[PDB]
Amino acid sequence: AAECTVPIGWSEPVKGLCKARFTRYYCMGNCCKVYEGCYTGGYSRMGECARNCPG
């Protein structure tokens, strides 16, 4: 398993209570982590997150 672990001092995104499902990609220090639900913040695409997250 190579996945993206939320680092020390970082938080999970806070899910909204909206009735929409979005897919968002958050830079968790050094890797991008994907969340689906009423999430905002982060990036809309994997490529955008990857280009803005240490590699």
Q: Is the dihedral of CA 9, 43, 45, 55 positive or negative?
A: negative
What Å resolution does this PDB entry report? 1.4
Give CA–CA dist 22/19, Å, rounded: 10
Class for domain 20-55, per CATH?
Answer: few secondary structures
Q: Are the C-beta atoms of residues 29 and 54 closer than 8 Å to each other?
A: yes
How was this model experimentally determined?
X-ray
Backbone angles phi, psi at 49, to 5 degrees: -65, -45
Q: Could you say which DSSP state residue 48 is in?
A: H
Q: Are the C-beta atoms of residues 10 and 32 closer than 8 Å to each other?
A: no
Q: Are the C-beta atoms of residues 28 and 4 closer than 8 Å to each other?
A: yes
